[PDB]
Design an enzyme around this catalytic site. Structure first.
Site, short mmCIF file in Angstrom:
data_model
loop_
_atom_site.label_atom_id
_atom_site.label_comp_id
_atom_site.label_asym_id
_atom_site.label_seq_id
_atom_site.Cartn_x
_atom_site.Cartn_y
_atom_site.Cartn_z
N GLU A 56 0.79 -1.22 0.00
CA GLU A 56 0.00 0.00 0.00
C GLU A 56 0.83 1.29 0.00
O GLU A 56 1.70 1.46 0.85
CB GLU A 56 -0.95 -0.02 1.20
CG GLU A 56 -1.75 1.24 1.38
CD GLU A 56 -2.88 1.05 2.37
OE1 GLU A 56 -3.24 -0.11 2.63
OE2 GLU A 56 -3.41 2.07 2.88
N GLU B 252 -5.87 6.53 -0.92
CA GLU B 252 -6.32 7.25 0.27
C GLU B 252 -5.89 8.72 0.28
O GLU B 252 -6.45 9.52 1.04
CB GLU B 252 -5.90 6.56 1.55
CG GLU B 252 -4.42 6.53 1.78
CD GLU B 252 -3.93 5.13 1.99
OE1 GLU B 252 -4.06 4.33 1.03
OE2 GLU B 252 -3.44 4.83 3.11
N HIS C 185 -9.98 3.36 2.90
CA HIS C 185 -9.14 3.66 4.04
C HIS C 185 -10.02 4.06 5.23
O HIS C 185 -10.86 4.96 5.11
CB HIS C 185 -8.16 4.79 3.70
CG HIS C 185 -7.44 5.34 4.89
ND1 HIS C 185 -7.95 6.35 5.66
CD2 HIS C 185 -6.25 5.00 5.44
CE1 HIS C 185 -7.11 6.63 6.64
NE2 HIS C 185 -6.07 5.82 6.53
N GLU D 98 -11.45 -1.96 6.36
CA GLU D 98 -10.30 -1.83 7.26
C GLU D 98 -10.83 -1.71 8.68
O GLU D 98 -11.88 -1.11 8.90
CB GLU D 98 -9.48 -0.60 6.89
CG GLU D 98 -8.22 -0.42 7.70
CD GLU D 98 -7.37 0.75 7.22
OE1 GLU D 98 -7.85 1.59 6.44
OE2 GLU D 98 -6.19 0.83 7.65
#
Lengths: 381, 381, 381, 381
Positions: free
Chosen positions: D231, D257, D307, D327
């Site tokens: 990521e 994000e 995110h 997440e």
């Protein structure tokens, strides 16, 4: 088999009368900012045979490269190992030589070596290259520097007398002169067309004077005059600009006279950077290089029309069917510096009614260094 | 504002003791075939300030270009018009200068001009370039020429003492030596890894010695040794080969030290020809050029790690965050010719525990031409 | 070396007389829907030297970013570490800063820092950037807001008196007004050409008012008027639309004034999104950023012509040969808000006969914040 | 239909106890260099209904944008004109707003507006978005900051108790730490795998800490650990780097994000910049934007995994079949700043045995601003 004995490199400086150019009269890579010479390279074998090469780019600096780096590599070698000698020069100097000074020095040497082979074999260079693919070689008239309209028009009318099927003129204004310069440029293309008409081809030259942006904006405006190509609109480093302009298919883009080596030209060809390739054999790497370039261009069907009307180009053009015409202008005064070769060599053919030809029986390049003009030269070695 | 007064270009020939290289001991562009010097360029202003430039490629030929074509263009000019002077040199010589001799001559001049600006302004060159982006500059140990295994291993162990986080070695066999040479190459990478281990980086160098075909076949075989890059596998003209090898993503391909001008390097960058760009500022066109190249490389996120550990590179590296390490080797004997600079200049920092640093207060490049070794030199002007 | 002591950021509100705009009179990104200010940033060093930066986008919000996030990062630093300070700001705020408010705040700070360096070094900023590449700087007349035909025509005739070689006008109708609005747009281009003629350049501006579809349909219709470019046809987010329109090669597409950071502009350049790049230095990231952008654009041969005629742009344009002209309009009333800078600063040159120039001897940006108009301002801190 | 009456934006500062982070313990965009807050936005209608939005990026600066530019645009409007209000905000601020501060401010407002619609309609936001596509929502455990091996291993073992089918950890070393840092990174991936095993997924996060070059060299080394994605290896501006790394197909690259707007994310998707898109709804432009992004991602079959584990994301994930997991991390101390939301809002579900779920009957986002922790906050308006 006789071996190379010596390499005699000389720089010729014109001390004769000259005609100072005028406003314009040709765009240039230096426009954005605010002695005429030639080089001879004579290679002699143990048996006294002498081959003649030449170059025009930065002659003193090129002579220093030939003398220090290239001459020593070919001395004691068979001229018929030309490809090996080319490779030897190319790789030994690769770090600094692959374009510019190095490749130009290599050209002059390689040219001499080819003159040798033809003389040693009792054959014109073109026969060794594939022979006669054409009855004679058509030429296009290459002058028409930019100037007052009546002046340019009178030049066109005079040139017209020798029956050219094509003509090239130079532009006088670029990016700095904005739209007004565009209009001045267009007036002159217009004026030349008025004389020569539309039953002939007209090519246009910028000599690296323009840029990608200006050229994209100018291109649509040139269409009405039906130009056959537009030569070196941008600086030679700007190959991406070449590709971009060429892919527009508005007017065919031409160039290559400031490109060096076989691979250099291969890249212009494969990337479709030019529609017409115009290397000069006395820059690009010599006949050894130009022969290989010609094969590539032919296979891609990109016409090759070498920069400059001299023997070092004419033999190449004779031997390849994808080379259909040559550049030409007759012997006039010294004004720009590119005329100097007509006073140094005898043997460069003169176009008559738009054609010139090569002799089936004259060995080598068919040129010799002449006495006629020693009075107008100071020659250094 | 003071103006440029003179340009003093000299060629230094090493007459001191030397150590003749051995079999191998580095692949080369000439492998396919069957005096050590340096150049100084001192530019002085009307007020006596002197800036020092240099070059290593074909020094006598480069000096002849500087003397005839480039010096006259900068004399009587403000050093702080550097970009204009760069452009003036670049365009005036474009026809023959854009790579090789021309661009190298330009580099030496431009370097001197930057030394001037820093001295005139009482600032280290790096401050004028953006200043301090790093606490100190890490270096990788760059020698390890190919030879007998125990020899190479002992060199690695010695180098190891100065705590480098990365090392570069040279290959000794290429295409001519087929699979057996491949095995010899691999043995040596293996041997070096045995000493230095896998907690450091190992870079590999071919110096234009290989080719596209051999490199494609060798690449899979190098993976087990985890090399950080493979430098100049092919000749500098073979940019398409670079792109092809780089796009394989087997081992990162590096190069550029034989590339010239801003546009030259832009093309390596945009076309993804290299994963790491390694121009030498004393070739590529000087700091003026390298500064612009660094901006391009940074934006594309292609690391720039200049060829050669000298001040003309270190200041550039200090001022740009995308330049994370420099090439280095300490002052050893004269064996290859690239060591000559340590005997001509004082001021090039010495790496300690894998780092070197620049002085926040030393104006200009922080080098001076030294007396210490005049005994081992014959200097021509 | 003196260090940064303080950062003084202020928001200026025009309370003086104003001229309310009319129907049209410029397309806008908001067309699809159914106090004028400026910012000053003064950076002072321990020795009392003060550098002046500025911004125009969302001033109060930008001031809050400078005050909270950016000022604290530069205080106690050497201005000559500008590249490091730029990077520090850029990376510390990257999460939210890389375009818009953040990058604009960074621009204002960075601009002040460059003013400092020039003042500290006793040099105009342009000298530190490469110096004088041009004798003077040509400008194009940038106003001609859309309105009644006679009104626009009278403006053109007045502007004509100061001898511009190029002019830019704004469109008044977009996608909402369909074909009738297209005809209204074309009438006005037509009307302006009637006055200024075809010996000058005409540029067209949409200010993000159009869209990809409308623009593709309009493009063929604009050809007869020979426009030099079409500016911001689509919203700044629609970079794919930019590329698509630009690749049509109907009229050159321009933009960038709403693009941020070096990489932001690199992408417009590499992807061929614009034919002309027009970032504003007081948005794009400051001179540190614009200097790097200029190198990229130059190498790609994409002309850079910054948005806005102010010193923060003019010095950049002076120092780079690929920056050939600047945007300009003279000091008129406050009507749109973009004129506010002429009442806050002294030192922005005035074009005369189509040119303006920079002083070889004035240190820094050559601007100062003025008293003259305090009566028409309410200034907050 | 009731209309928007007021917009109440507040910045919350944590004054409670905190745990200072350690060496590493997560790579960062600032690594190359040498009060914790949250924002609430409450939108109330004439009838007293209140919708709750929030943001975490640069809260004070975002509040100043909402207060000055965005609140005034929505007051007196029907919440059910949300798309129009989104467009109004987006276009009115486009010049400076399209990413960063602007788009974040827009997100907070838009989120409140969606909370309103659900409350006004007596429906959970997810029902208005398409309803229940999943029985419950699986989550992956997202913490495992880098540190001593035993520490990380103990965290993994604890997390393991709640039965996650996937885990994400952070790297602690980057480009500055060279090969040694690579080895440290690999040791930690290794250590985590020892605990959690290979019957679960492991994701890796760099938080913009690496670069294109380092990432290309690291990628092959990560393969043995079978990571599910990597990521944000590079900074958010380096979208070309994302595409390049993603196209290598060594380890799937994830990000987003730090990307803004529908078009911003469309470009990551179409250009294959990420294999997994991870925008945060309280940055990317709100639910209005995220809903449109989700349609694009779904059609391209690029998984969307927002995110952050909060309601502003969970409802979106519930309503779209191409959003398969979320997440998550449970309520621990304040250490990084991203935990602050658990002390400001009640209603964010807690994962049990790797799953959490939404209530079919709770209207709006199902969150409320809580009293419980007013003691640890200083709240400004």
């Amino acid at each position: 088999m006789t071996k190379i004995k010596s390499v005699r490199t000389r720089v010729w400086n014109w001390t004769g009368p000259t005609v100072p150019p005028t406003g314009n009269f040709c765009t240039n890579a230096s426009d954005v900012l605010y002695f005429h010479q030639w080089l001879t390279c004579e290679v002699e074998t143990e048996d006294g045979t002498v081959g003649i090469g030449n170059a025009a780019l930065a002659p003193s600096v090129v002579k220093a490269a030939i003398d220090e780096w290239f001459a020593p590599l070919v001395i004691g070698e068979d001229p018929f190992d030309y490809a090996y000698l080319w490779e030897k020069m190319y790789r030994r100097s690769h770090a600094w030589g692959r374009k510019g000074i190095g490749m130009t020095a290599i050209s002059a040497v390689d040219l001499a070596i080819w003159d040798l082979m033809g003389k040693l074999a009792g054959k014109p260079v073109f026969k060794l290259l594939g022979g006669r693919t054409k009855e004679k070689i058509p030429v296009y008239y290459s002058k028409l520097y930019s100037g007052p309209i009546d002046v340019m028009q009178a030049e066109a009318a005079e040139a017209q007398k020798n029956g050219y099927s094509a003509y090239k003129m130079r532009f006088g204004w670029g990016p700095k002169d904005g739209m007004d310069g565009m209009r001045e440029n267009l007036k002159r293309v217009e004026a030349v067309r008025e004389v020569i008409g539309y039953d002939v081809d007209l090519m246009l030259e910028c000599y690296m004077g323009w840029n990608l942006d200006y050229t994209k904006r100018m291109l649509p405006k040139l269409v009405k005059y039906e130009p056959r190509w537009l030569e070196e609109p941008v600086i030679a480093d700007d190959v991406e600009g070449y590709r971009e302009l060429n892919a527009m298919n508005i007017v065919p883009i031409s160039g290559g006279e400031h490109e060096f080596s076989v691979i250099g030209c291969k890249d212009l060809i494969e990337k479709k950077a030019v529609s017409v390739l115009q290397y000069d054999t006395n820059r690009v790497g010599g006949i050894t290089a130009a022969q290989k370039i010609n094969a590539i261009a032919e296979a891609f069907q990109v016409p090759v029309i070498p920069h400059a009307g001299q023997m070092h180009n004419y033999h190449l053009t004779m031997a390849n069917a994808n080379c259909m015409i040559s550049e030409y202008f007759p012997v006039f005064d010294v004004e720009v510096g590119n005329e100097l070769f007509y006073y140094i060599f005898e043997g460069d053919p003169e176009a008559v009614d738009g054609f010139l030809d090569l002799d089936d029986d004259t060995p080598g390049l068919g040129i010799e260094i002449t006495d006629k003009h020693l009075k107008h030269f100071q020659i250094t070695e």
